[PDB]
Amino acid sequence: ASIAQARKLVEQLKMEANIDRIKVSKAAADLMAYCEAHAKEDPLLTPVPASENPFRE
Template sequence: MSGKMCSGSTSIIQTRKLVDQLRVEANMGRLKVYCQEHRRSDPLLTGIAASSNPLKDRKTCLLL
């Protein structure tokens, strides 16, 4: 029975450490540097022109 108590207390300690780490990360101040500096060239923010999109299918489909 002491084996179950030991593994249970270990998981509680690990969970507390994880919660503490997540609290520290959640309270960190974040800067939106990337979006501000690269917003004109970021395709996720501005989109891709149809003429320069390498993934666009260039074939047309004709129905007869």
């Protein structure tokens, strides 16, 4: 009836249980490093002057 769905679910789960993981501190550090590295070029974050902004209303 549904033994095939059950077996594919459990093999997918034990595939999901054997993936290498890194610590959340390192991941947060990497996210902060990427955000602070590209923060200088961001017309959304730091507003560029209206001379080089193509949307002039």
